[PDB]
């Protein structure tokens, strides 16, 4: 459950991502696949080689959905209902994998935006991604 | 106890550049801020009511330096993480009863702090090698539960 | 995020508890203290010997909040606001303890309401308790 | 795991009444229903598409029976749970990459099933003795990660 300040921190930090959405999205995925290789088995038909155009294209989808989630932070279950169909009903993704991707996003954000990655903003982003993760892994229809 | 020779090289080289006077307090401080329930274990440390109070609490920064030294001890003994931490494992598991999921959290907070201070130099390969360090430290610290 | 089915499963099953609320609350507390002795460190000022009047009356307070949480399943943050300030701001309870109590509540319901404790209902109740737990451990004011 | 002599008598007594044809299947079945991601490990088992399909599935019932028999074997060797489950740990850790949190979930699902079957005979002190066993079983299965 996000406080008003959490929403303030998330909106302000993710807005600083901007045109670097797909770049940071792709970088998170590559960290995740490499730090935690078991995650690759959710993408068995993917080209997961370093720098592959498919992972770029997929990282951009992640970040754009996160952008969408930031704007609909007070309407998550409705705004994310289709992504929950995919991850919870079809892919039945284990929730520990969401912690891994969320951590890798935080790492990416800290590597690229050191001035904005303050303790308070770090804490808000973690809860925001945990909140998005809960929605994507729960079957609510 | 599970690192390839190239992963040991990468973690040793990066750690030689780590400011062991500031990185520990930064990581313990962020643990207390991002995961607020962990403040319960540090009730004698004084003011922890806001992010600024936590990150400026001199007891947090002093104790974080002890944390980081013990992480340094583990990095010089990478193939004997169980023994390096055995006594801390008794304290954290048998005396303090810190649930081991908290060991994973601090390890990953530390990973975020390393990324924060190194930027582009904390590359996906450097991160992956460090992910096995902090997971081995968490596992070792939880040994007395095992 | 509960589905409409989750909500009806939980109301029907918790509706059966009726007047056993305090008995079942106390039993679940006793189950948690016996099986997971470290949970006691949150109640050092309590009498925790078995059958204690203090535990019994506290069990009743717990079941009633659950009964209230069932009736307000669609605005937990407003309804649970006071209990969240207690458990997240003042007490700072480690989330693993909510999983232990949740599990002991499930054990209590299975032992007393075997016909209600269906695989689907078991799943909705687990999710309901995980959702209450999340609100009580989040600092969102 | 440390059971008193009085805990072991009451654990043993309850276990000898357990329906070995159904209890394991109900535990594995409830795991696949309450934690749907666990179905990813059982793709070859056929129809897991609804609760009723999962619980009636003969491959689930047959696999659950083997789960129950491993718990029977851990009960018989409480003194050496690590050697008793060494190869199941290799299978579950090295080959299947099951995350250890799932081991604890199954252990507690089993507890819920015992409570479902035995009602008020599943007292809190009986539960307390059973929690030590499943935590013991779950720790021995995660040892190949240790
Ligand atoms: C914040 C967390 C996450 C977000 C925002 C997210 C978002 C997305 C998006 C936007 C898509 C594309 C769907 C489409 O365009 O039709 C997708 C697909 C997918 N995601 Fe995620 N996801 C997250 C976490 C995860 C994790 C942790 C995993 C697995 C480790 C995962 C596994 C998948 C898979 C397998 C697909 C299907 C790709 C394919 O087969 O074409 N997701 N996700
Ligand atoms: C995972 C890596 C961790 C390492 C390497 C570590 C290391 C240490 C060390 C070296 C000490 C000092 C022992 C002494 O001087 O006697 C200590 C004490 C302590 N640790 Fe940790 N720790 C870790 C995780 C945690 C976590 C996650 C928590 C709680 C959330 C925690 C709670 C404490 C407490 C309360 C103390 C005693 C502080 C005091 O003196 O009041 N530790 N730890
Ligand atoms: C999981 C659902 C939970 C619910 C529904 C719940 C509900 C309640 C209620 C209704 C009260 C009394 C509020 C009042 O005094 O007016 C309370 C107090 C308290 N809770 Fe919980 N709680 C939960 C979880 C936990 C857990 C997991 C722990 C620790 C293991 C915990 C520790 C406490 C303590 C220490 C108190 C103070 C009791 C006193 O001193 O009077 N709670 N809770
Ligand atoms: C924690 C207690 C557990 C026990 C005691 C247990 C026991 C067993 C046993 C006896 C087997 C049969 C191996 C053989 O006969 O060669 C087995 C296989 C297997 N286990 Fe478990 N298990 C546990 C947890 C889990 C969990 C939580 C998962 C997944 C979420 C899992 C996934 C599997 C799979 C996929 C197989 C192979 C089935 C097949 O393809 O035939 N296990 N386990
Ligand atoms: C709030 C929270 C926290 O703190 C940690 C994990 C998960 C959550 O919330 C999950 C959740 C459920 C339902 C809705 C939402 C947000 O959607 N809104 O628009 O409110 N989050
Ligand atoms: C939804 C969910 C699941 O599935 C598992 C754990 C936690 C949660 O969400 C808890 C939560 C967070 C924020 C709000 C609410 C209630 O939202 N409604 O008003 O419905 N629940």
Numbering used by the authors:
A (entry chain C), C (entry chain A): 1 to 141
B (entry chain D), D (entry chain B): 1 to 146
What does the article say, verbatim?
Sickle cell disease (SCD) is caused by a single-point mutation in the β-chain of the oxygen transport protein hemoglobin (Hb), where βGlu6 in normal Hb (HbA) is changed to βVal6 to form sickle Hb (HbS). Under hypoxic condition and/or when HbS molecules become deoxygenated, they polymerize into long, rigid fibers, causing sickling of red blood cells (RBCs). The aromatic aldehydes form Schiff-base interactions with the Hb α-subunit N-terminal αVal1 amines, inducing an allosteric transformation that stabilizes the non-polymer forming R-state oxyHbS, increasing the concentration of the non-polymer forming oxyHbS. In this study, we have combined into one compound an NO therapeutic modality with the unique antisickling properties of two previously studied antisickling aromatic aldehydes, TD7 and VZHE039, forming the corresponding nitrate esters TD7-NO and VZHE039-NO, respectively.
We therefore conducted X-ray crystallographic study with liganded Hb to understand the mechanism of action of VZHE039-NO. As with the parent VZHE039 compound, two molecules of VZHE039-NO bind to the α-cleft of Hb, each molecule forming a Schiff base interaction between its aldehyde moiety and the N-terminal αVal1 amine in a symmetry-related fashion with the two α-subunits. The bound molecules are actually a mixture of VZHE039-NO and the hydrolyzed parent VZHE039 molecule in a ratio of 30 to 70%, both making similar interactions with the protein. The structure suggested a mixture of bound VZHE039-NO and VZHE039, the latter presumably formed as a result of hydrolysis of VZHE039-NO by the crystallization buffer, which is known to occur during crystallization of nitrate esters. The Schiff-base is strengthened by a hydrogen-bond interaction (2.5–2.6 Å) between the benzaldehyde hydroxyl and the αVal1 amine. The hydroxyl group on the benzaldehyde ring makes inter-subunit hydrogen-bond interaction with the hydroxyl of αSer131 (3.3–3.4). The nitro-pyridine moiety as a whole also makes intra-subunit hydrophobic interactions with both αPro77 and αMet76. The interactions between VZHE039-NO and the αF-helix are expected to perturb the helix and lead to direct polymer destabilization as shown for VZHE039. Finally, there are extensive hydrophobic interactions between the two bound VZHE039-NO molecules, especially the pyridine rings that are expected to stabilize the compound’s binding to Hb. These interactions are all conserved in VZHE039, but while VZHE039-NO uses the nitro group to interact with the αF-helix, VZHE039 uses the methylhydroxyl group. The structure indicated that the intact nitrate ester compound binds similarly to VZHE039 at the α-cleft of R2-state Hb to make several interactions that stabilize the relaxed state Hb, suggesting that the intact nitrate ester molecule, as with the parent VZHE039, could prevent deoxygenation-induced sickling.
